[PDB]
Design a protein around this ligand. Structure first.
Ligand SMILES: *[C@@H]1O[C@H](CO)[C@@H](O[C@@H]2O[C@H](CO)[C@@H](O)[C@H](O)[C@H]2NC(C)=O)[C@H](O)[C@H]1NC(C)=O
Ligand SMILES: *[C@@H]1O[C@H](CO)[C@@H](O[C@@H]2O[C@H](CO)[C@@H](O)[C@H](O)[C@H]2NC(C)=O)[C@H](O)[C@H]1NC(C)=O
Ligand SMILES: CC(C)CCC[C@@H](C)[C@H]1CC[C@H]2[C@@H]3CC=C4C[C@@H](O)CC[C@]4(C)[C@H]3CC[C@]12C
Ligand SMILES: CC(C)CCC[C@@H](C)[C@H]1CC[C@H]2[C@@H]3CC=C4C[C@@H](O)CC[C@]4(C)[C@H]3CC[C@]12C
Ligand SMILES: CC(C)CCC[C@@H](C)[C@H]1CC[C@H]2[C@@H]3CC=C4C[C@@H](O)CC[C@]4(C)[C@H]3CC[C@]12C
Ligand SMILES: C[C@]12CC/C(=N\OCCN)C[C@@H]1C(=O)C[C@@H]1[C@@H]2CC[C@]2(C)C(=O)CC[C@@H]12
Ligand SMILES: *[C@@H]1O[C@H](CO)[C@@H](O)[C@H](O)[C@H]1NC(C)=O
Ligand SMILES: [Mg+2]
Ligand SMILES: [Mg+2]
Ligand code: NA
Lengths: 291, 996, 32
């Protein structure tokens, strides 16, 4: 009963040739109309959104806190001697900072020299297209001392006492608000509380906090945070080649051959946290410089 | 070697009955008037086993429970669950932080099969739980003569070769060889099917042990008189014993509904493996390795298996089975409820099934006029004219001169169903006078009987003289009854409206053609007469001692004849008409005499009025039967005497060219062969019987239909459906509900098969376009095992779109449950719109949150990564892992809601296969609740506090509930115009390709 | 701020709808 393939009375795979053509033609027209309908409705959907602002922005309420060495498990395990052991790290750091070189930020028509001191926020009008392409404040690698250097094509970084810079999640129209001068026990920090978003790193328990001896922060003018003069963001369409602020963190006194956990928590009123997302506001890392 | 054992039972039985009295006693070593010594009796008792059929093969409850966990459909969910743990075995060992979705899925599939097994098992076991409440097996002791003395012992304590005596009313224990009888009439109804009480005489008569009268049979009752017999067969070796053992040892077959289940899976997996394999090849062509491609093969195939369809189908069958139980039409099998709808040939039994198996007064003769009496079991028919002197005289002759009365407890029972002691003929006469002529109690004691003359072995006449208490005439009233040929000789006067007339041939020949009318109708005719004795020649003190001529045998006044026969049940003829209207070929199968079988078939509808048999054509032309052409006779009678010498091909030819067939005098084994012959035609056969001869026919039949009270216990257990009310119209109700649930199952199947496309397409393009997951697993379970449960079940409550009792029976090889038309609509068109609607809501949510639909291409590579917490969207924003994963899960929840939205219209369109929604109408209240529950439950699964915590289903922004609205409306429009064109164009395009 | 969504109000309305539509469905199958 399963050899209905053909017969002398015309059937193929179950039906005739004229029937195969009728069915195939119908399905082509039907699915063609279905495709045209889905495309027309998806076009109306595209017409319900603008080019300068996402309609819903509540799912990114607390900005994240990422790092340069996008590790497979947020762990930094390498050998202070073997250059190939830490190649995966340095490669990502150089590729990340490749857009921050002095040669990359050379056009004066799209770049604006903000300043050597963190200042107040810079609002470039509204988010519409009435104004031209907004300017992006420059951020030279020199601001991150001891984690930038004037190295060649390969940024000879720190083998012993590594460097891990932190970055605030770029959010459109987001205005960072640092904590009030009434700081609720925020771990020794500079008095530049009004024009910089503070970020403080620490261990995770009584063990990690003891293994991590000394940490040195680097930023704009020497402040451990992000300057307010670089916010808010006006989208990729209006601000292409935008350079968000960076802040490096170096762990000088580490206990070699020991995996220790570090939590870099960014503080502020407009900075939320989440017990489910260990990256919202805070940031974790597992460093282990095994010799 | 049990094959040979079954072949020795399908053979017709043999005996050693035809032997001299001395030969039988020597072969058995038994005294004829004394039996045997009790020690000899106990010696055989502990030799071959007590006289009782071996209990049925007990069926332990764990066996049938594990039975419900297997089958054909549940087997598909089992291999699917195994593939889930197999896929999980490959996934766990190979990837990091594996997800608990596949393991969650494997255990859920296992739970689905288990719960379905428990629910279906509870229903099948409930049918048996009420069936065990019908075993009212009352122990019946037998009267055996041993050591020259009479003794009453249990039937099991009876052995072979000993004298056994039976009284009128006693049930024959084992098979006896009558040695001395005295007016003994036995009831061979429950065994061979002989309706009228067949008498038993010690003299050997026919070569067939069934027709001969020197044999008493197992499970047969002695109607009247007494008789003696030597036990020949005992226990299971008995006649009905070998029949019962044969029924238990016969195959049950494959139900038509189960065959549709098998053909259903043949396509479900055919496309599942086609999609899985073709996509497995595609995935390896792209970039996915063998490790991941194997999981893709399993995921695509496993998703294409409707998990919730097993439970919905089981409940869908259970609902119709519930209605069967409401009308006292129980089904021992949960799926046997469908078999009636697929039936195209019903093999019915005459005695007990079609007929009431009880002698009843059929017609009366008065004033040269036939008067039909009411013969309905419930007494709801036409009443004759009961206001004439001819009627009062005839009624008095019957009510008075008749050896029949009621019993003790027979006081509250109805006039017909109550018990009467005596001859079956005398019992019928009593039930008719007690119903149409007041009461026979006072009507009998009124005319005081002086001297009676019972029936005689020759010239069978029964007369008696009574006193006349009328306040006008003191003359004695003599009454007599007998065969018309035995009373015409003893009559000279004729009664008409009150006055007498001579035996003029102008009315006497008119009496002969009427006698030939009732006789030709297959009934038993009797003649009643009376006469006024001259009190001047026989004073009030003269005692008419029964010796010499005290009553004038001749010169009597004849009033009229009274015929009688077992009538068909009340709703039997109408039901036969409904089945033939439905296209079901009705075939009478019985062991009764052909003279009555042909007449009963004429009266129920198996034989149409006007059609002639092969014999009828010859008699109409006064020519031999061998000359007529059998093609000229649409109907034909088949005797068991000729069926024995037949081949399979000959029986096929009888069924092919004869539309109305009646099998008479067919042995129980021949009943089995007849059913096997109808099955060779490939048509679905249903057997409706009651006696033990119907056990081998009902068991092998696709569905056995037995009588709840008037049916023997053996054929009642071998059947698949029982009629506790014995209303044969339940067969018509069964065929109606069978075709009804079949088409409703098609609708429910297409509904669950439609949701499959939007359930798998997200995961398909997830592999192709490399976009984030459009729909999650847990969200799919909320559809197949949550919301859609109510619409699928509510689709069973759908009524008929047109008259189902007007269409012809479905061809098994043609009208399949699931064909390429249903799939062309569910998987091809309707489900396709549901899939695209889901993708619409998918792109809508992502684009409104900053992920343009064009930007989502190739994003799953970094999207599914857990540590890349800065993935650039379309506006330049950076999304963390949970920030974007929350969006993905809150994109699965509205996708699930999108499914419910398109399922609104999908439910309304699947509700009607051909009629418009305006024609059929939204009167299905369960379906209305199906929409309300499905919708409200869907909103609960998204807005309850903690859904995004347990089921990872986050709340929806209110604008998503309308992203899928036009898709449902479009589905409704396209399917509505489709069925509209099916209405105006019943030709081919919209009917052969889309209609299913 | 445009980065705050009133999820509690929308969620509240969703459950009230799930209550009304369900109890009304119950009234539907109870034609009395
Ligand atoms: C950056 O690294 C240089 C080393 O190349 C550090 O310079 C040393 O600073 C200490 C004081 O902390 C002096 O005692 C040493 O003599 C310096 N050595 C050299 C070679 O210059 C410098 O301190 C580091 N900068 C920061 C901010 O930590
Ligand atoms: C850097 O860390 C080292 C420990 O690795 C500190 O030196 C140790 O001090 C303890 C006493 O508290 C001694 O028992 C150890 O022998 C010391 N080890 C070494 C290698 O010197 C050191 O004080 C830390 N320095 C700074 C600037 O934090
Ligand atoms: C991931 C993408 C590329 C897969 C595309 C699959 C499309 C082209 C397939 C999926 C289901 C298919 C249909 C399945 C059902 C029918 C009816 C049958 O009697 C003839 C084939 C026909 C008419 C098919 C046409 C092609 C079809 C629509
Ligand atoms: C592009 C689409 C939306 C337009 C299609 C037109 C639809 C919506 C119109 C066209 C014909 C209309 C139907 C005409 C006939 C009937 C039967 C009548 O007893 C009630 C109204 C009813 C049920 C109408 C309902 C609305 C209807 C189906
Ligand atoms: C086709 C028609 C007749 C079906 C009628 C049901 C429609 C109108 C109902 C079914 C589900 C409903 C939604 C259920 C849930 C929500 C969330 C709530 O916080 C606001 C209302 C909102 C957004 C409802 C809008 C109206 C809605 C889409
Ligand atoms: C289980 C899964 C594949 C494995 C998986 N994650 O595998 C990566 C482990 N590191 C989760 C996927 C889902 O949740 C969705 C699953 C999919 C297999 C196929 C499934 C089960 C379907 O037909 C519908 C849901 C689909
Ligand atoms: C915060 O308070 C300190 C003294 O407690 C003061 O020196 C500093 O200027 C204050 N900063 C602001 C922004 O008020
Ligand atoms: Mg499904
Ligand atoms: Mg019977
Ligand atoms: Na059966």
């Amino acid at each position: 009963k399963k050899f209905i393939w053909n017969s002398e009375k015309k059937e193929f795979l179950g039906r005739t040739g004229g029937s195969w053509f009728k069915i195939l033609l119908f399905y082509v027209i039907f699915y063609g109309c279905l495709a045209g309908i889905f495309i027309g409705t998806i076009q109306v959907m595209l017409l319900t959104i603008s080019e300068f602002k996402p309609t819903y922005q509540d799912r990114v309420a607390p900005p994240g806190l990422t790092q340069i060495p996008q590790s497979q498990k947020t762990e930094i395990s390498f050998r202070p001697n073997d250059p190939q052991s830490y190649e995966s790290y340095v490669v990502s750091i150089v590729r990340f900072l490749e857009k921050y070189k002095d040669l990359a930020q050379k056009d004066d028509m799209i770049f604006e020299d903000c300043g050597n001191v963190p200042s107040e926020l810079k609002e470039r009008g509204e988010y519409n297209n009435e104004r031209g392409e907004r300017k992006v404040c420059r951020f030279r690698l020199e601001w991150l001392g001891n984690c930038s250097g004037l190295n060649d094509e390969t940024y000879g970084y720190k083998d012993g006492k590594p460097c891990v810079i932190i970055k605030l999640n770029r959010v459109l129209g987001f205005k960072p608000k640092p904590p009030k001068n009434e700081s609720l026990e925020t771990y020794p920090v500079m008095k530049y509380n009004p024009y910089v978003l503070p970020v403080h790193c620490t261990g995770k328990r009584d063990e990690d906090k003891e293994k991590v001896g000394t940490m040195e922060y680097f930023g704009l003018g020497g402040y451990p945070g992000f300057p307010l003069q670089y916010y808010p963001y006006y989208g990729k369409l209006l601000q292409p080649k935008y350079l968000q602020p960076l802040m490096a963190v170096q762990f000088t006194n580490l206990t070699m051959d020991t995996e220790i956990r570090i939590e870099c928590k960014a503080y502020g009123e407009n900075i939320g946290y989440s017990e489910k997302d260990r990256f919202q506001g805070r940031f974790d890392v597992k460093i282990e410089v095994k010799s | 070697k049990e094959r040979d054992m079954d072949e020795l039972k399908k053979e017709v039985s043999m005996d050693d009955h035809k032997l001299s009295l001395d030969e039988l006693h020597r072969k058995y070593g038994t005294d004829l008037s004394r039996g045997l010594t009790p020690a000899r009796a106990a010696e055989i008792l502990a030799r071959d086993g007590p006289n009782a059929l071996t209990p049925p093969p007990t069926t332990p409850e764990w066996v049938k429970f594990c039975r419900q966990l297997f089958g054909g459909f549940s087997m598909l969910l089992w291999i699917g669950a195994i593939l889930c743990f197999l896929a999980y075995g490959i996934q766990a060992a190979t990837e990091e932080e594996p997800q608990n979705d596949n393991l969650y899925l494997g255990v859920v599939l296992s739970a689905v099969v288990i719960i379905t097994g428990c629910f279906s098992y509870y229903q099948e076991a409930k049918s048996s739980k009420i069936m065990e409440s019908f075993k009212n097996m009352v122990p019946q002791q037998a009267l055996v003569i041993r050591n020259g003395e009479k003794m009453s012992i249990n039937a099991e304590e009876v052995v072979v070769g000993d004298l056994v005596e039976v009284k009128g009313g006693d049930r024959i224990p084992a098979d006896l060889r009558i040695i001395s009888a005295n007016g003994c009439k036995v009831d061979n109804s429950s065994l061979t099917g002989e309706s009228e009480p067949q008498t038993r005489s010690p003299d050997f008569t026919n070569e067939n042990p069934l027709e001969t009268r020197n044999i008493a049979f197992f499970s047969t009752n002695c109607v009247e008189g007494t008789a003696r017999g030597i036990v020949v067969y005992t226990g299971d070796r008995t006649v009905m014993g070998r029949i019962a053992t044969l029924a238990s040892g016969l195959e049950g077959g494959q139900t038509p509904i189960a065959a549709e289940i098998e053909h259903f899976i043949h396509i479900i997996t055919g496309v599942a493996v086609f999609l899985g394999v073709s996509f497995f090849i595609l995935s390896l062509i792209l970039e996915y390795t063998w490790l991941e491609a194997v999981i893709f093969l399993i995921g695509i195939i496993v998703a294409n298996v409707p998990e919730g369809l097993l439970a919905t189908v089981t409940v869908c069958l259970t609902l119709t089975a519930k209605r069967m139980a409401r009308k006292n039409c129980l089904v021992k099998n949960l799926e046997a409820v469908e078999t009636l709808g697929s039936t195209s040939t019903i093999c019915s039994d005459k005695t007990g099934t079609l007929t009431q198996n009880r002698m009843t007064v059929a017609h009366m003769w008065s004033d040269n006029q036939i008067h039909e009496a009411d013969t309905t079991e419930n007494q709801s028919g036409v009443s004759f004219d009961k206001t004439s002197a001819t009627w009062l005289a005839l009624s008095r002759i019957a009510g008075l001169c008749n050896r029949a009365v009621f019993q003790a407890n027979q006081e509250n029972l109805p006039i017909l169903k109550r018990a009467v002691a005596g001859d079956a003929s005398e019992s019928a006469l009593l039930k008719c006078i007690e119903l149409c002529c007041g009461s026979v109690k006072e009507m009998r004691e009124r005319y005081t009987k002086i001297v009676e003359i019972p029936f005689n072995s020759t010239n069978k006449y029964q007369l008696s003289i009574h006193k006349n208490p009328n306040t006008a005439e003191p003359r004695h009233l003599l009454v007599m009854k007998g065969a018309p040929e035995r009373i015409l000789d003893r009559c000279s006067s004729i009664l008409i409206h009150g006055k007498e007339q001579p035996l003029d041939e102008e009315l006497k020949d008119a009496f002969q053609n009427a006698y030939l009318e009732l006789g030709g109708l297959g009934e038993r005719v009797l003649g009643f007469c009376h006469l006024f004795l001259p009190d001047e020649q026989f004073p009030e003190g003269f005692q008419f001692d029964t010796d010499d001529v005290n009553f004038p045998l001749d010169n009597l006044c004849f009033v009229g004849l009274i015929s009688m026969i077992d009538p068909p049940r009340a709703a039997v003829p109408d039901a036969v008409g409904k089945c033939r209207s439905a296209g079901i070929k009705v075939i009478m199968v019985t062991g009764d005499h052909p003279i009555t079988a042909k007449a009963i078939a004429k009266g129920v509808g198996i034989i149409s009025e006007g059609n002639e048999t092969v014999e009828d054509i010859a008699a109409r032309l006064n020519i031999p039967v061998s000359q007529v052409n059998p093609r000229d006779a649409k109907a034909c009678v088949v005797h068991g005497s000729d069926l024995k010498d037949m081949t399979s091909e000959q029986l096929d030819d009888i069924l092919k060219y004869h539309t109305e067939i009646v099998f008479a005098r067919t042995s129980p084994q021949q009943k089995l062969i007849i059913v096997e012959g109808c099955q060779r035609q490939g048509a679905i056969v249903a057997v409706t019987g009651d006696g033990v001869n119907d056990s081998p026919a009902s068991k092998k039949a696709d569905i056995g239909v037995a009588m709840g009270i008037a049916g023997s216990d053996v054929s009642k257990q071998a059947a698949d459906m029982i009629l506790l009310d014995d209303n044969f119209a339940s067969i018509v109700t069964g065929v109606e509900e069978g075709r009804l649930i079949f088409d409703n199952l098609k609708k429910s199947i297409a509904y669950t098969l439609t949701s499959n496309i939007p359930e798998i397409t997200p995961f398909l393009i997830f592999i192709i376009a490399n976009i984030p997951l459009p729909l999650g697993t847990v969200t799919i379970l909320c559809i197949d095992l949550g919301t859609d449960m109510v619409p699928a079940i509510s689709l069973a409550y759908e009524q008929a779109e047109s008259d189902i009792m007007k269409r012809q029976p479905r061809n098994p090889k043609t009208d399949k449950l699931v064909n390429e038309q249903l799939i062309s609509m569910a998987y091809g068109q309707i489900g396709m719109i549901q899939a695209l609607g889901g993708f619409f809501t998918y792109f809508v949510i992502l684009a409104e949150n900053g992920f343009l639909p064009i930007h989502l291409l190739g994003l799953r590579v970094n999207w599914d990564d857990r540590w890349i917490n800065d993935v650039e969207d379309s506006y330049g924003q950076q999304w963390t892992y949970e920030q974007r994963k929350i969006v993905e899960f809150t994109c699965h929840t509205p996708f699930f809601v999108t499914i419910v939205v398109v399922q609104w219209a999908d439910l309304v369109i699947c509700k009607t296969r051909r009629n418009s929604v305006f024609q059929q109408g939204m009167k299905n209240k369960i379906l209305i609740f199906g929409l309300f529950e499905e919708t409200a439950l869907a909103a609960f699964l998204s807005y309850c506090p903690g859904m995004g915590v347990a089921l990872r289903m986050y709340p929806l922004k209110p604008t998503w509930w309308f992203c899928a609205f036009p898709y449902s409306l479009l589905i409704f429009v396209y399917d509505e115009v489709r069925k509209l064109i099916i209405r105006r164009r019943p030709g081919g395009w919209v009917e052969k390709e889309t209609y299913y | 701020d445009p980065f705050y969504y009133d999820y509690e109000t929308v969620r509240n309305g969703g459950l009230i709808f799930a209550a009304l539509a369900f109890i009304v469905g119950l009234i539907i199958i109870l034609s009395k």
